[PDB]
Amino acid sequence: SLAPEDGSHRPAAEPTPPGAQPTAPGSLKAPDTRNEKLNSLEDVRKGSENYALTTNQGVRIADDQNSLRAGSRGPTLLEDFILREKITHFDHERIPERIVHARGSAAHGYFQPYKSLSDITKADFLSDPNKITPVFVRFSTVQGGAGSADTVRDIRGFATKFYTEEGIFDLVGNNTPIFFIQDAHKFPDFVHAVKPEPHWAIPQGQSAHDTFWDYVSLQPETLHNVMWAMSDRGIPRSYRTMEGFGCHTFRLINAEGKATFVRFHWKPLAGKASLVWDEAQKLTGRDPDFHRRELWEAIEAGDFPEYELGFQLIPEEDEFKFDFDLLDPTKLIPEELVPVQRVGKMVLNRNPDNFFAENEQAAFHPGHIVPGLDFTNDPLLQGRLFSYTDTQISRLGGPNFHEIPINRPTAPYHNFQRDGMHRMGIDTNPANYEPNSINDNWPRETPPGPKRGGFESYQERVEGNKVRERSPSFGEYYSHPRLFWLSQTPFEQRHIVDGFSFELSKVVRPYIRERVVDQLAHIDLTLAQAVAKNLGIELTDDQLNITPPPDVNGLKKDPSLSLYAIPDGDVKGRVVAILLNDEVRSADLLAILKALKAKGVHAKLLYSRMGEVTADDGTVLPIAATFAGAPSLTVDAVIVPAGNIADIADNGDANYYLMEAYKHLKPIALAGDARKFKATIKIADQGEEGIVEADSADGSFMDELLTLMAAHRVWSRIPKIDKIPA
Amino acid sequence: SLAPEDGSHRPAAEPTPPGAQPTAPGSLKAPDTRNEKLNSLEDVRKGSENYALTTNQGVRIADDQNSLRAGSRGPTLLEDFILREKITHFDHERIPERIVHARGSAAHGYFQPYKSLSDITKADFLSDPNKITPVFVRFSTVQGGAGSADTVRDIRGFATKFYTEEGIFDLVGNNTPIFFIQDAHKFPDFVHAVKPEPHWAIPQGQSAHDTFWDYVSLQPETLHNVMWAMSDRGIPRSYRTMEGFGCHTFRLINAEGKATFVRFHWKPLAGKASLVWDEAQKLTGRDPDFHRRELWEAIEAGDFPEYELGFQLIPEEDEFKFDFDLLDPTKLIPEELVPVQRVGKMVLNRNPDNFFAENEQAAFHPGHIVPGLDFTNDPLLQGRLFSYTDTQISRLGGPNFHEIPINRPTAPYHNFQRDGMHRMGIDTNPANYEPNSINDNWPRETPPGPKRGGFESYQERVEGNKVRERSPSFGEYYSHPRLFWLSQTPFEQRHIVDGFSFELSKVVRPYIRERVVDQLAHIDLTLAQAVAKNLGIELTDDQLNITPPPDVNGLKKDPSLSLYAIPDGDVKGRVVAILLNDEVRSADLLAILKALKAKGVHAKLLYSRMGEVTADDGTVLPIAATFAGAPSLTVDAVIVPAGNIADIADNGDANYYLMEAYKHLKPIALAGDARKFKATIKIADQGEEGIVEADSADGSFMDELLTLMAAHRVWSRIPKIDKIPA
Amino acid sequence: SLAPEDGSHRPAAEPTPPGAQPTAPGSLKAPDTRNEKLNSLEDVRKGSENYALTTNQGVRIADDQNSLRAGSRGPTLLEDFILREKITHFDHERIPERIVHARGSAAHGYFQPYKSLSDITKADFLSDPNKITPVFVRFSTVQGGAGSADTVRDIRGFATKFYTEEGIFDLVGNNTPIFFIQDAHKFPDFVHAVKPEPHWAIPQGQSAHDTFWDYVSLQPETLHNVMWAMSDRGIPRSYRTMEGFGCHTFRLINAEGKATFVRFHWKPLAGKASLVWDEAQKLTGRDPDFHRRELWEAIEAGDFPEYE
Amino acid sequence: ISRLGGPNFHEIPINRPTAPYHNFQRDGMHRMGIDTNPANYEPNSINDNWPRETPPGPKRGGFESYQERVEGNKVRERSPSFG
Ligand code: HDE
Ligand code: HDE
Ligand code: HDE
Ligand SMILES: [S]
Ligand SMILES: [S]
Ligand SMILES: [S]
Structure with missing residues (x-):
């Protein structure tokens, strides 16, 4: 007995404020917080108290303090199988980190819709306000390694795995409504440019270096999400106080077969809030775990993160009614043009038990849709569909990653797939092919229908030649950056200028800084001049005369783009x-x-x-x-x-x-x-x-x-x- | 519905003779055959009847006959996630086969002792005739790949996994009492010599090639197991009609800590029986799955394979009482000198459900022992202890291979190991180290003891210098080959002559054949003469005069070495x-x-x-x-x-x-x-x-x-x- | 020295007929044969004569017959890095075999076009009758594992990797002109049906079992290739005496941008020839390596496989 | 074995010895070296036993462990002198 006699080693199993008690595994801190997914993991949860220490083969260990040797000062013997098992497992603990969003913090919770959405989608999870769907959410940065710092300037990931009765739906979103690039074919170029540079592997968790700004200077499509990253959006106070977006136009499909275009939103019920740069940077040193810590402790305290799911809905007939292409992921849909409709509420109310097992091995992928949803031809989304299944084969060791417990559907799954590394399910079906008579053709295909039907793709008309060609409709790069800029408060505009100035000051080759400044002059002259002044660069008469890009469908601002223009503060x-x-x-x-x-x-x-x-x-x-x-x-x-x-x-x-x-x-x-x-x-x-x-x-x-x-x-x-x- | 009206697609769930019914997964053929292991696998068994066909994510499939394409004669679309998941799983079905014993056939059963062995071992599975221990046993050839033929001439493996209440005990044996080599360091040399030759990867499932006989001619320690392989031992009629041996001297340890040397045996209750060479070779062509089929169908029929476990026991003070070294795994212990004590019976009564999940992923390893057993300095066993843990890292994909269902202990297992690829167990322990206070040091070490104690090595005295040196006592190679030869009937002797004759005729380099015949003349002149005649070789005058090797402790034969000398037939x-x-x-x-x-x-x-x-x-x-x-x-x-x-x-x-x-x-x-x-x-x-x-x-x-x-x-x-x- | 005094351990490095000499690695058998790809592999070829035996780290080994132990009858010591490196490499020798076509036999060669095809394709390897293209060709069965038998009844694979000056072109064909199914979505269903059945993993190298014929009887699209498999095409005499086919319509594209539909053929210059069933089946027993052996020994004899 | 994907990690360029290395180890994932040795085992006659063991000695010799004396029982015990 090494525990203190007063029992002070163990945290109370009750909600407690940050710092009052040591933190613990969720099932020990909050044993009575339950949902259908957390319950279904019981088969693999492993306790410890009162159990004998053993090998993995169930053999009780007598001395876990010494190797077996010939004499107490002699050589270690090969026949020490307890030593070798223990060291072997240790020697193989690590798996490949995610290519991007390697740094991430996660939690369990549940979602429920406010009302039935059957008029617009047959998705079972959105059919009934009394239908509760367990979720597992992972928030992340983008560039840095799994051991990088939380409060860097970067986009954030916001991924939600919905364990629905008709299959897993993953909504794999970010904290800005657009992305840097238009076509998935460029994603390795973009990612390589922002990631640490390849000769020396610097810098970590930062876009403030030559290759990123080189790429941005040569690829003006990137300027919109760059504006977002340079704003205080790039440095959130907490994962509880940022927005989420689903990035692309998807489709909802109702029972009658009607398609509606949709963009997904998460509104933070705790309000929008961000740090300032000097604070965020210094905080990466004083507590590189600050957001992971804050999320865990908010949940332990009962300050559950809550978000409202919202939809921007655009009828099929209105596809072409905007100045920008709905399928262009570098364009946002201003809320002044298309409001967000409230859909339901997600509450994150329990931390995991083991970070590696639940967080590190969770696999989210936007191709994981369910009947009542469908894709569009957004050329970024189209390539993502390839990447998120392929990457698991190395990350998670093979094609059976859906059997890793956090990934398992709570819906039934049965099919004819067999084998692969790490196969857990033992199939008893006499058949492993269809059609088959030897098992009466089970499991069987299911026609599409209003509920519980098979998945069928919406029969969208396709017409064109096989081309590698960017749509001309995608070739406008400055109007959305401008709309974003004009929508920010004067202090937010200042923080944007300071982000650009700080970052460009870390770019060693001055011509790159100059080229970026030229692009800023195509968005807004006041912005371009302020950054130029901080960089000791003087705009040419030509740059002073670049005419600004058009308004977006007549808008000169949209306050929903600001963090702060409309108060939404919450102190709890x-x-x-x-x-x-x-x-x-x-x-x-x-x-x-x-x-x-x-x-x-x-x-x-x-x-x-x-x-x-x-x-x-x-x-x-x-x-x-x-x-x-x-x-x-x-x-x-x-x-x-x-x-x-x-x-x-x-x-x-x-x-x-x-x-x-x-x-x-x-x-x-x-x-x-x-x-x-x-x-x-x-x-x-x-x-x-x-x-x-x-x-x-x-x-x-x-x-x-x-x-x-x-x-x-x-x-x-x-x-x-x-x-x-x- | 595709099944026939008359329901004749489904086999009766009752024992039926070979060929009367289609064969079936074991849990459908024999649903009421149970044991603790078969029961504990229920959590991972998956059925099929009356379930909808889905993706791995639980999404119902409407059309499992077509890819999604742009028009019905158009290109396939990257957004077809259903196709890609299904093809991805297929594309990664295969895992590395075992380095040796890749071809093997396996079944579930149970073991029960005839009486308590607590006087000689504290091994819990041997402590009471009421102790029923689930087993999973895999029989195998050695050289050929997983897709090679069953009735080859080869050594056979006989591996038994005992799911005891105090841990997994794997008894990993073969069908002859010795091995080809003395020291584990030469295992890759020998195995590379027997396996298909590296330039062209020929021949499959055969020792009848130059490199094997080259190695044998240069390493006379091999000659003993070679004699076994060239006898009809090398071509059993059935895995039910062959003997098993643990190959090494191990130790039993009792509650007082006293060690007894032991060698393990399995005696087939269906008696000993083998094919003749022409029949076995032709059989590799008419039915390369003959043994796998014969085992499966015996169990379906209720002809359950039964073996008696037997111990040869040698007191510790008798270590040096024989004219061979007890630790030399090229030497057998004649039953005339140390009889086999009959200890319990194993019955194989249920086939697997899924060959890949249960047989191909099963991992046996002789280092898997339990308290009550221990190793010896046998230098072949000593190196085996390294390899059976190390090889699973690639074969089964990482260090959590014990979490693969077939491999799981039924005994409790708890420790501080964490992570690794495809980690199933979700640990709730606040601590992942010991000593710890935060979980009051659980799970805790357990002192060795008479029952339910921790594992402690027998405190054998070690005295010598650090050397790479074969013991002089291992340096005798012909006495055991000779004892084996003299123990065979005249027709078993003819078949041995024919096996050497046939194999050496397939050796293209004639000096190799000559060098092997020279080695035979050191064993027995009549043997050497008979093989030489078949090869058109004439023994020299020197070879005719080689003094035969000595008898083994006064024995000039032991009929227990013969398959047929003592009547042992069973027609059931x-x-x-x-x-x-x-x-x-x-x-x-x-x-x-x-x-x-x-x-x-x-x-x-x-x-x-x-x-x-x-x-x-x-x-x-x-x-x-x-x-x-x-x-x-x-x-x-x-x-x-x-x-x-x-x-x-x-x-x-x-x-x-x-x-x-x-x-x-x-x-x-x-x-x-x-x-x-x-x-x-x-x-x-x-x-x-x-x-x-x-x-x-x-x-x-x-x-x-x-x-x-x-x-x-x-x-x-x-x-x-x-x-x-x- | 362990080699015999008369040098009879070493195969003659010159063409010799089957059975005349032990078979040898190619670059030792026929050191004068070359092409651009063979030359380019020289940087990774490792010899052996006159070298010391070493660890993978380049440390010379004094005794490769014993483990390090405490006394010559004592326990093996964990500090024996030479033993663990050698056993670790052995322990991890195997890689997953191919999902299909796991059994196959391969050789190096070259290809040359009879004339320029620039009127119908801009493919550089077909542009000049003097342009010679190294190839590496693998022939295979389909169903059985890498250690299954050659003369089974099955489709055969015929895969050619062309190392062209404008990239690798792989022509991945079979010995019949069609396939059993229409849409790739069904490939795992058909492959599962023909492969060993999932309960007991029987039969190896054979479509003669319930699941295969269940699938066929339910999917009449399969009958065309089933006819070919059931004919003597399913049991060729030699990879040298079977036809090859590209399976699909592809396109040729010329310099003017014109597309022409193309199906690919290989014609065996040694002619078409198959076994009969009773012989092919017994031969899987007597010599499960007969086609791999036959191919290797034909090249060692100078009966080089030729295909148009 | 997991970190660098197999037993051929010595073939990854940074890891390769500049000293010669030859032995009878074969295969493994992403095997770079193409062995021409007719033999993949020793002792062999078919390649006159090359590559060969080398006795220890003053320079360029085979590795042999120093013959330290070992005397004790098989124990999992911390030396008292470490306490
Ligand atoms: C809409 C939000 C968004 C966008 C536009 C993208 N990512 Fe993400 N990503 C992967 C690939 C990928 C591609 C190919 C593209 C555009 C073509 C995007 N991303 C843009 C990935 C490499 O397959 C990824 C890495 C590991 C993995 O499992 O998938 C991946 C990660 C990722 C996450 C993290 C999810 C998690 O595991 O926590 C998030 C939130 C995004 N992406 C969002 C996203
Ligand atoms: C005496 C019974 C016996 C003996 C003496 C040996 N084998 Fe086996 N073997 C492996 C390595 C190995 C070494 C290093 C030695 C002597 C030093 C032996 N063998 C001799 C292995 C590579 O670790 C092996 C391959 C796959 C695996 O998991 O372990 C292995 C297999 C094996 C089996 C098959 C068990 C099964 O998976 O069904 C059997 C019955 C033996 N060995 C017997 C054996
Ligand atoms: C036309 C000749 C032909 C056809 C029509 C197909 N195969 Fe082959 N095959 C693979 C998958 C695959 C699919 C998905 C389809 C139709 C949908 C076919 N096959 C039909 C594979 C699993 O991707 C494969 C296994 C290992 C690999 O690298 O690819 C594969 C093998 C294969 C070979 C083997 C090449 C070799 O290594 O010798 C050959 C000749 C074919 N396929 C031909 C083929
Ligand atoms: S996006
Ligand atoms: S053995
Ligand atoms: S094909």
Whole structure:
């Protein structure tokens, strides 16, 4: 017995806030959270308590501390089969990482539609509001390895595996509504350009290098998703606070055989929020696991990630009614033109048990559709259909990857396929071919029908010659970048300029920077000039006269493209740093902690050391982390209670905590004599918007703080930080 | 519905004789035959009847006859995910075959001890006659690939996986008591020498080529197993009629920790029986699946293969009591010196459902032992311990091969190993290391003990320097070949001479043949002379004067080494061909079948076409096969009843059937006018021992036939067969 | 020295008739034969005479007869890297065999066109009667595994890899002009039917079983190729004496962009010849390697397989 | 075996010895070397036993292990001197 007698090694099996208890496997943290998929995995879940340690062959091990040797200082013997099994398994633990989206964090949950969608699709999962579909979702970055950092500037993946009664449906989306390239044939060129360069394998998790910008400069189709990546969209606060999109026009197919074009949306019910660049970059160093950690802890805390599934629906007859081609994956469909219709709600409510087994081996692929859905001729989507099945053969070791437990359908599956590496299912069918008489032709084909029918493709008319040719309709590259730019707030536009400027400054060959600047001048002159100024580049008279691209169907902005133009803030699940001193005013802390609790906002009590401090009234205050150990990067706001301020007033880390949080536009609240820290961040006596201050933490001090937090960051402070040395 | 109206597509789920029903997966043929392992495989068995045809993702297929194309004569579309999944699975069906023993046939069964062996071993499966242990046994040849022929001349493997309550114990044996080589380091040399030669990959399933005999002539340690292989041991009639041996001295360890040396044996309860060379070779062409079919059909019929497990036990103080080394795996322990103690019975009573999933993916390894057993320093066994774990990494795709259903222990298995390709187990343990506090150190080590204890190696004393050196005590190569030779009957000796003669005639380089004959002269002059005569070689004066090797501890023979010296026949499960005519004397056939049934001997009714014939009393007789379709090679004896003989009397195939059976020493019975056939095999009017003849098939006629069948073959006929052109 | 004094261990490096000499690797048998592809493989050919025996890491081995143990009757030691490297390579020698056509026999050769075909195709290997194209050809059965018998009744494969100056062109044909099925979606159904049945994995190298004929009886499209398989075409005498076919209509495309439909043929210059069934079936027993042996020994004799 | 896909990892260019290497090992996935040796085993007469073992000695000799003395029982036990 090595566990502590007080049982403090084991986390409570109840929802607890971030940092209160060690984290655990989902079935141990939340044993009563169930769904049909989680239940169906019970056959392979393996426990441990009270069991004897064995080899894989079930042989009990007596000494797991020593190899077998001739004499206690002698050579190890080949007949040590316990040593060799154990080391063999270790020696083969690793499998190939995903070619792209290798870095990803995942969770189980469930989806339910708001109402039946039978008028527009025969998809069984969308047929009845009382139909619950288990999901498994993996969020990811794109470029970096499985051991790269979470808060890089990159697109994010948002993949949802729906375990439906009529088969697996994978909705394999991203956090922007378009992609960099038009045709799947170029995907290796694009990916190679953004990935670490091949001579030296640098840089990790970054597009800020020559080959990416070289490619972008020579392939203007990429400019739209580049605008998105350079904006604060490229640096989300949390997977809970970004949008999701299905990237392509697909089809819905109803029982009557009518096709409707659809683009898929996920709206984050926690709101849209992003970091700022300096914060995101520094955070890759201070906690490269920050998003994986935040997702896991939100789920353990009961702050379940929730998203609303939405559809943009376009009738068959309206295929050609836009300025852009619906099948072009570099074009978005503005919500002002085609609204998103609410469809249903997904809640992620349980972490996995074993990350490797459930997360690393999960296979998602957009060809996994079900009756009631179908594809289109989008030439990016068309190639994806090839890639996601082929790649599993090396990644997951062969064609039986659907038998890896997380991948298994909960719907029945029976067919005539046999064998392959790792074959688990033992087929008893006397036949392995059809048609057969020896088993009366079972399992049998099923006609298409309104429910429970076989899959049949929509009979779309095809007419043309066999060509390798880009549609002329796809040859417009600047209008959507422009629409995106004009839709952003002035502070968002500033962060876009700064992303381009920062990234191009890492491009070693100056001609590439110049070429990119030329492309910016084809989108918007103010943008092009601002980036040019940061790069010491002067636009030519010609570049000054490039006429801007047309409006998109008469639109000059669409506010749904902004993260922040329309408020959607939610504070629940956010976190506040509380900077302790050695004699805190206990009435300030009561008021602070209860107000945060009442709104679902977490707190972490920080100090210059671990252990405890004692408040004015003798209350013993447990310390979560030190100032340097849990930097302001990791919180949404900072509160300093009154008390013995002289304890920390000269602590460099405590001052720096506030400068860093100030620079990154976070709300800061100072009570009583904590107002002496005003001088550290240079705040005028009469105060400033975004700094909450009062004699004490009572009255409106906490409501004012929470109002700031609902608006995420203090954008008005941007001109003030510009000269802060932090 | 494609099945016939009369339901004759489905085999009866009751025991039926060979050829009476189509064969079937074991769980459909014998659904109520159970054991703990067969039951535990229920979670992975998949049926088929009344299920819809789907993709692997659970999506119902409407049309499994066509690819999706643009028009019905148009190009196939990349978006056809149904086609690609189905073709992808097909394209990756195959896994590497085993490096050796790739050709093999397997069945489920059980083992039970005759009494408790706790005085000599604490192995839990041997602790009580009530302890029933599920087994899965795979029989094999050695050289040929998985698609090679069964009735080759080769050593056979006999591998038994014991699913004990204290772990998997694999007893991985062969059908002779020794091996060709002494030290594992030479295994690839020997195996490369026997296998098809590397320039052109010829010959398949044969040792009868230059490189094998080149290696043998240069490595006299091989000569002992070579003698076995060249005897009729190399061509068993049936996996049911051959012996098994564990090849090495292992140890038993009892609760007091006392070690006893042991060699393992399996004694076939159906007795020992082999083919003759001409018959075996021809059989590789008429039915290369003969042994696999014969095993499957024996089990379907209720002729369950039964073997008695036997131990040769040698106290530790008797290590040096013999004039050979106990650790030298080219040496056998004569039963005259150390008798075999009969320990328990294994019965094989159920075929697999899916050959690939259960047989091809099964992994046996002699290092899979349990507490109560242990190894010795046998330097061939020592290197085996390395290879059987290492080879599964490519063959079965990674280190989780124990999770493949057939391989899973039925005993509990828990440890801290994680990940690896196609990981099925989802571990919930917070800890993946020990010692740990976070899971109170579970799963925990277990001290060795009398029952349910951890594995601890027997503390054998090791004293010597680190050397690559063969023990001087291994340096004797001819005494055991000689003892084996002298123990054979005169007809077994002739067949050995013929095996060496035939093989060496296929060796193109004549000096190799000469060098092998030189080695034979070191074993026995009469043998060496007989083979030399067949090769047109004359022994030199030196070779005629080589002193024979010494007896083995005073033994000049041991009849346990002979297949046939001690009567051991069992006719149950054997098969007789009955050559029909278009008007059979029904009273002969009634008697014939009645008597065969009372002894559990099967019959096949043969004619010159399929369909039926009609006997003299109007009995309709269904025909199993033509004369050419089911050759005498596939039966143990031939009966020709009376009736219209003129019908078949000039049938070439009918006459040849008897010539072929006669040549191969099989019992032939002729009734009434069937004695007209004595003419074709040149039998004197007064008769011949081994030919049963009478006016009719009365009671004594069948008794004499069944007596001959108990003695397997008519060895006295050998001098008569030289003159027969067959 | 282990070789005999009279050098009779070494096959004569000159054409010799079947059975006259032991067979040998090609580059030792016929070192004067060459073509562009054979020359290009020289960088990976490894000899052997006069070299020391080494690990794969280039370390010379002193004793390749024993494992390293603690005393000459003691246990084998984990530090024996020479033993583990040699046994690890052996343990992993096998790769998956081909799903179909797993049994086959191959040789190097060359191809030359009789005249330029530039009026009907711009394919460079057909543009000049002086242009010689190295080939590597594999002949095969279809159903059985890599260790199954040659003279089974089955379709035969006839695959030619042309190493052209404008890329590899593979002409992947069979010895009949058609196939059993119409649409590739059914290929795993037909292949599963003809292959060994899934419960017991019987029969090897034979369509003579229930599932094959069940499929045929339910899919009359198969009858045409079934007729060919049931004829003596299904049991050829030699890969040298069978026809080859490209199976499908392909297209030739000339320099002007004109498309012409094309079906490909190989005509055996040694003529057409097949066994009879009783002989072919017994021969699978007496010599399951007869066609592989026959091909190899024909080339060693200078009876080179020729095809138009 | 998993990381580099088989036992021919020494043939991956970076891994290849510059010193000669010849032996009787054959096949494995993505086998690069084409062996011409009539023999793939030793001892052989058909290639006069090449490539051959080499005795140990001062330079260019075969590898032989130092003959360290081993005395002890087969134990899974940590040396007391390590404690
Ligand atoms: C719409 C969102 C989106 C788009 C447009 C693309 N990816 Fe993704 N991707 C793979 C290939 C692939 C291709 C061929 C294309 C355009 C032709 C895209 N991508 C663009 C992949 C290599 O097959 C992939 C890697 C491993 C795998 O299983 O499939 C793959 C990953 C991926 C993910 C991660 C899913 C997960 O396992 O967590 C996501 C969210 C996307 N892609 C989105 C996506
Ligand atoms: C005595 C019974 C016996 C002996 C002495 C040996 N074999 Fe076997 N063999 C493998 C390697 C190996 C070595 C290294 C040695 C002596 C050093 C022996 N053999 C001699 C193997 C390559 O590891 C093997 C191939 C596939 C596999 O999983 O292990 C292997 C197979 C094998 C079988 C087949 C078991 C089965 O899969 O059905 C049998 C019965 C033997 N060996 C017997 C055996
Ligand atoms: C026309 C000659 C012919 C035809 C019509 C087909 N095969 Fe072959 N085959 C493979 C798959 C395949 C499919 C999907 C179809 C129709 C849908 C055919 N076959 C019909 C394969 C599984 O991809 C295959 C196995 C290994 C491989 O590399 O490809 C394959 C083999 C094969 C060969 C063997 C070439 C060789 O290595 O000697 C030949 C001659 C054919 N097929 C001919 C063929
Ligand atoms: S996309
Ligand atoms: S053995
Ligand atoms: S074909």
